[PDB]
Design a protein around this ligand. Structure first.
Ligand code: NA
Lengths: 415, 420
């Protein structure tokens, strides 16, 4: 028999992103109650939520309207600036010597071990967000999992991905014989949903002032919380979550499908208190899209501010500026598209042009990274809003446009 | 090999429209007996028939004088207010995220799959009825089928349309090469016939108090019910139904005629109990001439005439019947007066109300203008939903003539003004 290991990562920071760290803390509680040991649970969370000045209940983090704390006892392996690509990949590979900091807890796994990786945050076509620069490109993650497989240091690896466009991290990249089973919250071109907001569906107390969960995440976690996990397979959870959140986003699976025949117990253990709660088979809580969760906040601030006050004038100005910036980024991309391809634009059609199923986002990932840097050098940093344009940039690469031509068109539109 | 999928939709509601939901439930029974799975059969029915207070046999729906129930086991994917354009189009496209409600069952089809779409209700020039507004405009449906084709998520798609003027949904709009074969009950300018009314040739027992089938529908369905469907092609069913009901309406076909070479089995499966009933190649059943709008009235007349004299039931049924008829008169007078105001003479008004564009031409060039004209008329003159949507021909002619919404609005306001 082997050891059950886990890697839990929130790829974001800021109180607005409370939900991603809340999701991670909840995933830890499940694994802990299931009998998975702390020494085998690697936690990556920026850790700026529990004691943020906006937190109504400092020292606590909730992930449901039940207001149950999930923060207590959560290991702090990689926090702050240690939540970075380098540490995440070295952790997966089990290389303690490649770390920039942190506890040094890694996936120093053996061939009969089981691995459960859970990522939660912002996602973009072929890119997962990080609270630190740089972002996680899909090819680096897949290369890492291929290297992990080559080492032969596990029997089964399960990867759950909570992010917009998360199918694009695995689609046309992940080979099927690595003993890796992947479940993603949304497909290419799709945004994932937040759950448990003060003003949306099940009532979360207004004082939290942010959404405390992510729809795909709370769905699989609330399910994992209430059953004897020996009685529910990974496949049955996939189907359960997929069907339950189908109205919001499309749960997709990748890799080695026979791995999903394993019970959830094989990866998450099981809570003895749920032994009699057997799974038999084989109420919308979804709030808003992740990419509009911050915008909903600027709106709420503006709406709640008193008429005629300086607070209303300021919140209005801030909200208008956030929206004008989205218009500026959209116009810059459209102007670049017109320059590279002709005045008949297509910026929106290219962006609404997603490759056929089973095809990777881009053929040349170095070209994609280069196109991002090239846009960012002449124009502003893409950051949260504009990172969705990795699709347009991937299309430029696939079309054969060179960095010099992107640099030329970018300098011309962005002065 | 692929999976056989189906979308069954009754575009109406109300006990007077019992027949369209009966038609759908019967189509489901055929598909079920043919081996087509429930998970692949999307049903849209308002579902206000089985337990309507006027139903003599609650929990049952019949589609023939044989009184055989067709309601049992019919999936309830989209019922009530979920029978709407948005859900119908998202279902076709296989988009679960674009639904307003319902089961979430969609045409989440693969490239080798077969699709059978069956629509039954009221039809109008370039518009199919929905249980409430907005109605289904032909351009949106055709755009949806073009988008579906672009996705490449099917091998063959068969669309049967039971409705008046149903050829106008595809005429001048549906291209070839989409692997879509269409069969329609009636051509432009033609009303479709109903079947099995309490006073039609083979009559339904009187207690049903309404017509229980539609002629084109019961013809293809009764045929699909009795044969080994491997031995009858879509083309043979087309010729069979067309010839059998030629006295009533013109069955028309659109799209990719080589698709119709496929056996009915490829879309509807086949009932093992009919294996020995091989299709080959007494023609005396001629139903009485009852058109869609005449059928709706049969019900209002029935609950009036059967009600006891002096009873609150008779007074209520009388009032509703008089109001239904006065409303038809109001819509007819308004459109005619509007036509006279815009075009200057009874002759030109009549021309604009009645002209059918040549065959192969779309009803209207500007579908947004048509939608606008409908909304403009409705704003000043009241809903065309209950009755009057047959006047989309007149509205399409207004559009094609270059009349603007402001001129339609002034004429409608002037005509439908009726206060001190
Ligand atoms: Na009307």
């Amino acid at each position: 028999a082997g050891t059950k290991w886990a890697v839990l990562i929130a790829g974001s920071k800021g109180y607005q992103n409370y939900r991603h760290q809340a999701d991670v803390c909840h995933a830890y509680q499940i694994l802990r109650k299931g009998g998975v040991k702390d020494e085998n649970i690697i936690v990556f969370m920026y850790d700026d939520i529990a004691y943020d000045i906006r937190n109504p209940y400092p020292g606590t983090i909730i992930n449901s309207p039940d207001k149950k704390d999930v923060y207590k006892g959560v290991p702090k392996d990689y926090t702050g600036e240690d939540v970075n690509v380098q540490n995440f990949l070295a952790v997966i590979l089990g290389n303690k010597t490649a770390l920039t900091g942190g506890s040094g807890k890694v996936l120093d796994t053996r061939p009969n071990d089981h691995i459960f990786i859970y990522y939660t945050d912002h996602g973009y076509p072929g890119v997962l967000g990080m609270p630190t620069e740089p972002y996680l490109y899909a090819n680096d993650l897949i290369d890492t999992l291929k290297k992990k497989h080559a080492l032969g240091t596990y029997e089964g690896l399960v990867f759950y991905v909570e992010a917009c466009e998360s199918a694009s991290i695995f689609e046309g990249l992940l080979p099927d014989g690595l003993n890796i089973y992947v479940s993603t919250a949304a497909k290419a071109g799709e945004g994932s949903w937040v759950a448990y907001c003060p003003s949306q569906e099940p009532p979360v107390p207004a004082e939290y002032g942010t959404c405390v969960g992510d729809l795909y995440s709370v769905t699989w976690m609330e399910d994992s919380d209430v059953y004897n996990l020996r009685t529910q397979t990974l496949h049955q959870q996939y189907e359960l979550v997929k069907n339950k959140i189908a109205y919001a986003s499309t749960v997709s699976q990748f890799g080695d499908f026979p791995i999903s025949k394993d019970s959830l117990f094989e990866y998450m253990g099981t809570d003895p208190a749920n032994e009699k709660r057997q799974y038999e088979d084989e109420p919308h809580v979804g709030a808003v899209h992740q990419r509009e969760a911050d915008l909903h906040h600027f709106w709420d601030k503006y709406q709640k501010a008193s008429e005629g006050s300086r607070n209303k004038v300021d919140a209005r100005k801030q909200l208008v500026e956030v929206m004008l910036h989205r218009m500026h980024v959209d116009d810059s991309i459209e102007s670049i598209a017109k320059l590279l391809f002709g005045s008949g634009a297509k910026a929106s059609e290219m962006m609404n042009t997603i490759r056929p199923p089973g095809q990777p986002l881009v053929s040349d990932w170095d070209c994609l990274k280069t196109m991002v840097r090239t846009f960012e050098t002449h124009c502003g940093s893409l950051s949260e809003y504009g990172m969705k344009y990795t699709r347009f940039l991937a299309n430029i690469c696939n079309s054969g446009i060179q960095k010099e031509k992107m640099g030329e068109a970018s300098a011309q539109v962005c002065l």
